[PDB]
From Swiss-Prot:
Gene Ontology terms describing biological process: adaptive immune response; cell-cell adhesion; cellular response to glial cell derived neurotrophic factor; establishment of localization in cell; negative regulation of microvillus assembly; negative regulation of neuron differentiation; negative regulation of thyroid gland epithelial cell proliferation; phagocytosis
Gene that this polypeptide is encoded by: RAP1GAP
Record-level Gene Ontology MF annotations: GTPase activator activity; GTPase activity; protein homodimerization activity; small GTPase binding
Main function: GTPase activator for the nuclear Ras-related regulatory protein RAP-1A (KREV-1), converting it to the putatively inactive GDP-bound state.
Keyword match Phosphoprotein: yes
Membrane topology classification: Peripheral membrane protein
Parent sequence residues shown: 76 to 411 of 663
Lineage summary: Eukaryota, Metazoa, Chordata, Craniata, Vertebrata
Protein name from the UniProt record: Rap1 GTPase-activating protein 1
GO cellular component: axon; cytoplasm; cytosol; dendrite; early endosome; Golgi membrane; membrane; neuronal cell body
């Protein structure tokens, strides 16, 4: 097994696998038209055909393109080169980055839209539920739901947990007795199961359960019958995608699971493609799929309306952070 890539923004991990730990150059300059600029370049050959991989980062976006070069003898100067991957660039000259730690500051800026840990939600839909409270108040698990939870991940005591918590309570034990968690790739996934989360008596919205699942971006929904579901049954500013999972009595060895997505017309197509039966295993086969689908699901929402707006301001701020560091540190490599 080698496995397909996680559907994070592909253009992020470029620097990582082409520039880092190999010979490149990093330059910075101040364009008053586009903002702070942090721009890398690598001269490389494939076969005997010489190319020139460029990567320029703006207050806003990050531009990539490969440019071939013959014995074109002229090496396009750094300003020309910049303009060959982004035309709106209009600067006097670029200044070279000379801080020997720079490559690590840079890789860490590009790889900030890839995340190492995930908090997902789990909800049980019983009988023929429709509203919010019908779901969020369900106590005591279905036979199928119990079987499902131990298969999906390992049970873990929260009371002295060393890994990624995801907003849950370790020390005081305020949030749930136990939970479900697993280590997927080099990624850490923590689930917020409603039934495992603490119950309040008389509470309509069930706030103690809805504080976690409500701040989740993606969540699983486990059914027993074929009771319909939409992203409107639940009211949340954060939940943008749901994975529907339903049990079957048509499996002599392992129950069959009917699986389907429920997007908001805000999120793109994502995840490993859904099989033509739309049915699944009971073993590690399906488990591996589901988690990729959820991880790819969140990465899909990153592009959606709500998060992209916030991301815009984060990116520019983190760029200024970086731009400063490469400026001051490159300067005190000679002074001035």
């Amino acid at each position: 097994t080698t496995k397909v890539k996680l559907e994070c923004n592909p253009t992020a991990r470029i620097y990582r696998k082409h520039f880092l730990g190999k010979e490149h150059f990093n330059y910075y300059s101040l364009d008053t038209a586009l903002g702070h600029l942090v721009f890398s370049l690598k001269y490389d050959v494939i076969g005997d055909q010489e190319h020139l991989r460029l990567l320029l980062r703006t207050k806003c976006r990050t531009y990539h393109d490969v440019i071939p070069i013959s014995c074109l003898t002229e090496f396009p100067n750094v300003v020309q080169m910049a303009k060959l991957v982004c035309e709106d660039v209009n600067v006097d000259r670029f200044y070279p980055v000379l801080y020997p730690k720079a490559s690590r500051l840079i890789v860490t800026f590009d790889e900030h839209v890839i995340s190492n840990n995930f908090k997902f939600g789990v909800i049980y839909q019983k009988l023929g539920a429709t509203s919010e409270e019908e779901l969020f108040s369900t106590n005591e698990e279905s036979p199928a739901f119990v079987e499902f939870l131990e298969f999906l991940g390992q049970k873990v005591k929260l009371q002295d947990f060393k890994g990624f918590r995801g907003g849950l309570d370790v020390t005081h034990g305020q949030t749930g007795t136990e939970s479900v968690y697993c280590n997927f790739r080099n990624k850490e996934i923590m689930f917020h199961v409603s039934t495992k989360l603490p119950y309040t008596e008389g509470d309509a919205q069930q706030l103690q359960r809805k504080r976690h699942i409500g701040n989740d971006i993606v969540a699983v929904v486990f059914q027993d019958e074929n009771t319909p579901f939409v992203p409107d049954m639940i009211a949340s500013n954060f939940l943008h995608a749901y994975v529907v999972v339903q049990a079957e009595g048509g499996g002599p060895d392992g129950p069959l699971y009917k699986v389907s997505v429920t997007a908001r017309d805000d999120v793109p197509f994502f995840g490993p493609p859904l099989p033509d039966p739309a049915v699944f295993r009971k073993g590690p086969e399906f488990q591996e799929f589901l988690l990729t689908k959820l991880i790819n699901a969140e990465y899909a929402c990153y592009k959606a309306e709500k998060f992209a707006k916030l991301e815009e301001r984060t990116r520019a701020a983190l760029l200024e952070t970086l731009y400063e560091e490469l400026h001051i540190h490159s300067q005190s490599m000679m002074g001035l």
